[PDB]
Design a protein around this ligand. Structure first.
Ligand SMILES: *[C@@H]1O[C@H](CO)[C@@H](O[C@@H]2O[C@H](CO)[C@@H](OC3O[C@H](CO)[C@@H](O)[C@H](O)[C@@H]3O)[C@H](O)[C@H]2NC(C)=O)[C@H](O)[C@H]1NC(C)=O
Ligand SMILES: *[C@@H]1O[C@H](CO)[C@@H](O[C@@H]2O[C@H](CO)[C@@H](OC3O[C@H](CO)[C@@H](O)[C@H](O)[C@@H]3O)[C@H](O)[C@H]2NC(C)=O)[C@H](O)[C@H]1NC(C)=O
Ligand SMILES: *[C@@H]1O[C@H](CO)[C@@H](O[C@@H]2O[C@H](CO)[C@@H](OC3O[C@H](CO)[C@@H](O)[C@H](O)[C@@H]3O)[C@H](O)[C@H]2NC(C)=O)[C@H](O)[C@H]1NC(C)=O
Ligand SMILES: *[C@@H]1O[C@H](CO)[C@@H](O[C@@H]2O[C@H](CO)[C@@H](O)[C@H](O)[C@H]2NC(C)=O)[C@H](O)[C@H]1NC(C)=O
Ligand SMILES: *[C@@H]1O[C@H](CO)[C@@H](O[C@@H]2O[C@H](CO)[C@@H](O)[C@H](O)[C@H]2NC(C)=O)[C@H](O)[C@H]1NC(C)=O
Ligand SMILES: *[C@@H]1O[C@H](CO)[C@@H](O[C@@H]2O[C@H](CO)[C@@H](O)[C@H](O)[C@H]2NC(C)=O)[C@H](O)[C@H]1NC(C)=O
Ligand SMILES: *[C@@H]1O[C@H](CO)[C@@H](O[C@@H]2O[C@H](CO)[C@@H](O)[C@H](O)[C@H]2NC(C)=O)[C@H](O)[C@H]1NC(C)=O
Ligand SMILES: *[C@@H]1O[C@H](CO)[C@@H](O[C@@H]2O[C@H](CO)[C@@H](O)[C@H](O)[C@H]2NC(C)=O)[C@H](O)[C@H]1NC(C)=O
Ligand SMILES: *[C@@H]1O[C@H](CO)[C@@H](O[C@@H]2O[C@H](CO)[C@@H](O)[C@H](O)[C@H]2NC(C)=O)[C@H](O)[C@H]1NC(C)=O
Ligand SMILES: *[C@@H]1O[C@H](CO)[C@@H](O[C@@H]2O[C@H](CO)[C@@H](O)[C@H](O)[C@H]2NC(C)=O)[C@H](O)[C@H]1NC(C)=O
Ligand SMILES: *[C@@H]1O[C@H](CO)[C@@H](O[C@@H]2O[C@H](CO)[C@@H](O)[C@H](O)[C@H]2NC(C)=O)[C@H](O)[C@H]1NC(C)=O
Ligand SMILES: *[C@@H]1O[C@H](CO)[C@@H](O[C@@H]2O[C@H](CO)[C@@H](O)[C@H](O)[C@H]2NC(C)=O)[C@H](O)[C@H]1NC(C)=O
Ligand SMILES: *[C@@H]1O[C@H](CO)[C@@H](O)[C@H](O)[C@H]1NC(C)=O
Ligand SMILES: *[C@@H]1O[C@H](CO)[C@@H](O)[C@H](O)[C@H]1NC(C)=O
Ligand SMILES: *[C@@H]1O[C@H](CO)[C@@H](O)[C@H](O)[C@H]1NC(C)=O
Lengths: 174, 320, 320, 174, 320, 174
């Protein structure tokens, strides 16, 4: 999409991610881990259902109308009736085509957006304690056990307490 | 140890789906949903709508009251089905603008015939025919009244009927086109007849044509059917020198949500809210490729047979 | 002291507005504007368009020249208004395809009648009637000419009129349907009459029908009206054995931006560029839910009564 | 929207901001302050008026047409006239629906975009002298009086002259 | 030395292009492409479609077989062109619903006339006329058969023709409207004639009108043309007391992709897939402002004369 | 557009860039240079051609229809035929208008996006070795000859080997 996240700087998706649509994998003092992010997943899904609801189940009652197929050859009236119906169908057929085209382009971008949002959001939490590796991963420059990581996923990560440590590791030879 | 790594990512499936965008004809996403209804229920659901099977009868023949269409005397409908193998068994006929009259009945959505006490003195009523049998004996249309000579005279009839009801009365009448000169005289005395029907607002005078046509169930004569509406306050009037097929009353016009459709599929005990000639179809999707002919709360018909709207993200599986 | 903080942000209001997006049915924004015109001015603006009040007259009766519709002799319009309580006071009549002729006048947008010097020797002109009074005395339509016997003969008329003008001439004529045999003869000699009207390009022969109808202002006879166009170069011709109601000239057909509408609201001294049966409506919005019947530079009619287009950002007030 | 700025990492809007649609609040040696940003505000407004102009006041003259309501029951012609008008209305009704839907989705995103633009723009001026606090605020790591701040709002802020000072405060224990 | 600088950027041209967005009426981009086809080829491409030049003939006159339209005897087409200066040279005529019959031929897309062996005993065949010359001598329509008296009688004809073919047969017939009483009798014996044509399904009885019209190539009489379809299984039948212009056979109705168009531009040896009155037009663009009248695989017509779709980025040249 | 890149923080375009639609100019130990980026250019172009293909060359065969112009004055039928055609044309005319409007707005943003993508992508490669100058240029804080630069354009730049040097130059008085 337009954000270059999905199908972009995130090289590929995770078939192993079943908890949700977005999330983290990590590697810390306590081993390796995977986890979903609900907020973001649900933010995407809520929208698509928005779309669905709009398009699906919004039908109108129509009753007696004109004839649209004939056996006897008549001329100027049947011609008019056919062309008239013919026109309706074509016009509606175009609407339905353009619709899915629009929506889908939007759905893609919409989902790409949410991938970039969770990224930047996370980035912003880490402040000076980590560096974008450019593959959708942050190298965090301090010991960050599962509770620490949790804090990040929770949104409750306090950088001021690791800052000195992180800055240390970020800046020397060695 | 003294660093950690935190990787962001999204999900992906193994068996994805293709969809159209503004820039791609076929691009793969995790999921999608179909917006085109392609297949039909198979048959016609008796519910939710009041469906009526035409069987051997066309709507016009039920209106008219063709003996083999007497089952539909007291019948109304939401949708009336006309079968292809249906036919007529009464006296051969033709209507100027058959369609319009068919449509005008179908929309009103009933065949219930309120009789009126017409009088026609100096003329014998209830003409019979060997090509319109009710039971074994010779009958005619139940709702039309073939007038012929009484004794040695067919007097110029001048008959009225005021519409004092709270609605438009629909009247149905016709005229006899004889096969030969000698049927004309030997049935209506006069050598050339007339039928003027009129109201305060309008008129319609018909004159018949003598001479034989092809046989239709053994009849080279014809009966052309006409109709007339009458608005509350207005008065009906008939004037006939000869060859009139009189009416027995009126149909009442309701502003209906009724209609008629040409279908050949069986009616059954399923349920739906929309109906086509191919059968009932599912309501839920916004579009449809079944048939441009439909009734009721019903999807839009479009030329394409499938339009998948993506319901998930772009699917990006691991590359080999 | 030795740091500072700089916070970015956006505005927000207290009383916001809801709007539809592709993903939300009701989402709140700072501002929005209405694209549907729901209410009408109330009455019909005399400006900018030339409006004409029909009052007691229908357009056809002004064309025809019904005595009580003589006010509209010299009148043209952009839009002609027909009132529901209007009526006819002249000789009872009916037109085959009333609409088409109504439409053809309304589009031309005038009733100004150029007279022509027709001659009809052997027949008395200007037939009067007790059911079409101009002043107190018995008159007829101003623009139609009832021809009847002179002395003891109604000779087969053969009259022409060449259109050498630079435009199509519209001609209006009719035929008398008598009430009884004895009116036919005692007014046109012959027992059965004819009216053939024709040009190089076309024809239309009518034959009348004797016999009484219901009374309309004390007349059981009728007068059916017909018309004819004549292209520059072509010639008009009339042939009448009996029962002709002749023309006095023609209407000139202009390719107009005129029309006619059925409305009951008062006309007033406001201004607008578009007109409906509910009254004039404001022009500025792209859509409208007033009435599908409209005239002039005028919004599109749509089923929905309100469609708010957001004209500001998403409104996000401080959370409690 | 898609940028996660409005109704996102900017927690909420300011009812007190009446000068414009976007701007700054701050806290410095000289007290507290608020101010608008015209460029960005006017960039948003110019677009919405673009939209309006396109949609509003673009009406067409139409004169004599068909009848759309009838008293007498006729059949095959009146049926055709009704269905024909019926169709027009439905088709146009859909256009008007989809229109506002499209536009509004766009208007939202459009306004969200402009919020992110002014942010990044500002960020880029500050260079190494400040840190994203993740709430739409920068901690500026040096004394920045009202003239200094002004410079930022003006676009005339020269980082090279505070750099040493800022870097100092950014990197120590203390 | 010990740093470097790396600047990102995009291209730009000197002579750009303006385009419309949702927010801008005129904004400049590097490139764009035109979606509206404004100009036409100039003339009509003989390919890919089978085009047929009408020249001095209208389609109806080729159907009928007007002597000067005998070139089109054996001709079919995809599209038939009618020229404005074309005309008729045979006996003057008029058709009730000319259009419908024109349309019904044009759609079938051929004039090839299968003859049938009709018999009409007691009446002389092949009536000639001084206003319908084939070569130098007096002829009539090639495909219509003017029946008149034989000796001292015009017997009531009763003739049939069963359609046992695998398709609907189209039949073309008419009736003579004489100029005076004495032509009627001196050509058909009887003083008033009739023409009833009918099948199992339908009928159409015509009665002619005596009396002179304007001269058209020296004829004050007229010939009104009618038609009739016959479905496989059904039987044709004609009944005529007088004034019948009989048929010589039928046209075969094909469900065609054919049509007819009114154009004045020359036909030429270019190629295209779509055709308008202004000439052939280029196919490739989705829209068109040439003419709402078109044929074949052909762009949509729209009111606007240019709609540029941007095919490149926003063009931002260096500012002075 | 919505990313503020083209016609935004990139002050203007380069008429001298003929190799492609996007790329770099630079200034290093070995002189000055210009070069295109194919990936990004081709990513943009592939999309616009996507658009074209969708809109262009997708015509439908239509044959015998109704008449749309008449000589004789008729009334209720000709009225209906005119209004019916009249309606078709108007409805289609609106579709074509809205189409280009939508597409073009999208085309602009689409191209803006790709400009931001190549920027962020590049940024991410440089990691701690450079600083956004805010004009679409990075100051790279180490000697970076043409091979080094090449590496960046190639996507093969290894930051770990210049890091010490860059960090040095980034952080002192002097
Ligand atoms: C006018 O002409 C037509 C045909 O020229 C006449 O139609 C004939 O009518 C016959 C009865 O009068 C009828 O012949 C019959 O043959 C079939 C055999 O299967 C049976 O159904 C009966 O025996 C039936 O009587 C046909 O319809 C037809 N004859 C033929 C040989 O096709 C029509 O009567 C004539 N009408 C007149 C002179 O008034
Ligand atoms: C054919 O029959 C109809 C009805 O059978 C006849 O209509 C009658 O005509 C009457 C005048 O001839 C008229 O009766 C009248 O009564 C009202 C009372 O309010 C007054 O308006 C007048 O006195 C008027 O004369 C009615 O219209 C009607 N009669 C009734 C009782 O309804 C018609 O004349 C007949 N026409 C023939 C035989 O040619
Ligand atoms: C009924 O009346 C019309 C006109 O009143 C008659 O039309 C006349 O017919 C004439 C031939 O009968 C014809 O006059 C002629 O003059 C031109 C001179 O250029 C030449 O073409 C011929 O000499 C031609 O004969 C006109 O068409 C017309 N006369 C005039 C003076 O306009 C019509 O015959 C009458 N029909 C009846 C009584 O049955
Ligand atoms: C993927 O899409 C399919 C259908 O295209 C979804 O299947 C259904 O889920 C919806 C969700 O409300 C139900 O209403 C239907 O009953 C299901 N239909 C069918 C045909 O299976 C499926 O939910 C989607 N997968 C997800 C969301 O994981
Ligand atoms: C409706 O009409 C049909 C067709 O005539 C009747 O069919 C009968 O049964 C067989 C097979 O369906 C037909 O071949 C015969 O023509 C009919 N039988 C006889 C003895 O004539 C059918 O009975 C009728 N049904 C109803 C409900 O009216
Ligand atoms: C649904 O049934 C309709 C008939 O009601 C089908 O239409 C006919 O089918 C043939 C294909 O065999 C087509 O050539 C025509 O469209 C129709 N012909 C006739 C003589 O009616 C239609 O194809 C069916 N469609 C679906 C999706 O079931
Ligand atoms: C919020 O929207 C309202 C109307 O929906 C705006 O009110 C008007 O402003 C426009 C701006 O040109 C004027 O043309 C109209 O005269 C006003 N109409 C009404 C009904 O008040 C208002 O401008 C908007 N608020 C803003 C921009 O702050
Ligand atoms: C138009 O006709 C009306 C209806 O006949 C005339 O109305 C008169 O006044 C009262 C109340 O409006 C009606 O009940 C009467 O029928 C009429 N009065 C009389 C004495 O007959 C009205 O005068 C007419 N106006 C115009 C301008 O023609
Ligand atoms: C505008 O007036 C029209 C009449 O010109 C109204 O239409 C009628 O109103 C009733 C509601 O009472 C509806 O059932 C029908 O649509 C109409 N009936 C008849 C007999 O004409 C319409 O409702 C009015 N609409 C507005 C917005 O004022
Ligand atoms: C700019 O647009 C023009 C036309 O609007 C392009 O010119 C053509 O290029 C296409 C590309 O396939 C060809 O199909 C046509 O033959 C050309 N048409 C005309 C009229 O020149 C041009 O390619 C575009 N410039 C670019 C892409 O640099
Ligand atoms: C078709 O008819 C035209 C028009 O009558 C014929 O034109 C001939 O030549 C000149 C100039 O075109 C006309 O003024 C004359 O009317 C005609 N000449 C003569 C001697 O009468 C043309 O010849 C005809 N062409 C075809 C192919 O039928
Ligand atoms: C294409 O030709 C058509 C005729 O087939 C032109 O339409 C006529 O042209 C005039 C302008 O001089 C217009 O007033 C009318 O639309 C038409 N009038 C008549 C009497 O037919 C049309 O203008 C031409 N358009 C192009 C793009 O070539
Ligand atoms: C996907 O589909 C393939 C082929 O239809 C099938 O063999 C396989 O089991 C499926 N696997 C999934 C969904 O993982
Ligand atoms: C908003 O509306 C409420 C309720 O209608 C009203 O009481 C209040 O004064 C308004 N306040 C604003 C716009 O600040
Ligand atoms: C651009 O167009 C101008 C004016 O038409 C012309 O003089 C000039 O040579 C062109 N220059 C370009 C494309 O660089």
């Amino acid at each position: 999409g337009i954000f270059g996240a999905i199908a972009g700087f995130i090289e590929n998706g995770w078939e192993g991610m079943v908890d949700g649509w977005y999330g983290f994998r990590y590697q810390n003092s306590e081993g390796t881990g995977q986890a979903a992010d609900l907020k973001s997943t649900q933010a995407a899904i809520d929208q698509i259902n928005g779309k669905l609801n709009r398009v699906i189940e919004r039908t109108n009652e129509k009753f007696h109308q004109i004839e649209k197929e004939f056996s006897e050859v008549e001329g100027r009236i049947q011609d008019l009736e056919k062309y008239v119906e013919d026109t309706k169908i074509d016009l509606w057929s175009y609407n339905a085509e353009l619709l899915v085209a629009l929506e889908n382009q939007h759905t893609i971008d919409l989902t790409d957006a949410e991938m970039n949002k969770l990224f930047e959001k996370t980035r912003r939490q880490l402040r000076e304690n980590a560096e974008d590796m450019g593959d959708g991963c942050f190298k965090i420059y301090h010991k960050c056990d599962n509770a620490c990581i949790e804090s990040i996923r929770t949104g409750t990560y306090d950088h001021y307490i690791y800052r000195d440590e992180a800055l240390n590791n970020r800046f020397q030879s060695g | 140890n003294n660093t950690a790594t935190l990787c962001l990512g999204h999900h992906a499936v193994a068996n994805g789906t293709l969809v159209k965008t503004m820039t791609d004809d076929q691009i793969e996403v995790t999921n999608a949903t179909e917006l085109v209804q392609s297949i039909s229920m198979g048959k016609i659901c008796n519910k939710s709508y009041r469906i009526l099977d035409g069987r051997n009868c066309t709507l016009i023949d039920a209106m008219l009251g063709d003996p083999h269409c007497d089952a539909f005397q007291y019948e109304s409908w939401d949708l009336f089905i006309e079968r292809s193998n249906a036919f007529s068994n009464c006296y051969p006929y033709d209507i100027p603008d058959y369609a319009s009259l068919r449509s005008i009945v179908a929309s009103s959505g009933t065949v219930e015939f309120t009789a009126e006490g017409f009088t026609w003195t100096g003329v014998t009523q209830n003409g019979r025919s060997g090509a319109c049998k009710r039971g074994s004996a010779d009958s005619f249309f139940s709702r039309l009244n073939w007038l012929t000579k009484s004794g040695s005279s067919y007097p110029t009839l001048n008959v009225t009927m005021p519409n004092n009801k709270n609605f438009d009365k629909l009247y149905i009448w016709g005229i006899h086109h004889p096969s030969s000169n000698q049927e004309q005289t030997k049935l209506y005395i006069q050598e050339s007849g007339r039928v003027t029907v009129s109201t305060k607002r309008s008129q319609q005078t018909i004159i018949p044509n003598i001479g034989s046509r092809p046989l239709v169930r053994g009849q080279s004569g014809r009966i052309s059917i006409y109709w007339t509406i009458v608005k509350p306050g207005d008065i009906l009037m008939i004037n006939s020198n000869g060859n009139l097929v009189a009416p027995r009353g009126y149909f009442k016009l309701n502003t209906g949500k009724s209609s008629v459709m040409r279908s050949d599929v069986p009616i059954d005990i399923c349920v739906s809210e929309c109906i086509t000639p191919n059968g009932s179809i599912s309501n839920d999707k916004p579009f449809q490729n079944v048939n441009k002919v439909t009734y009721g709360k019903c999807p839009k018909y479009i030329r394409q047979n499938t339009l998948k709207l993506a319901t998930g993200m772009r699917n990006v599986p691991e590359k080999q």
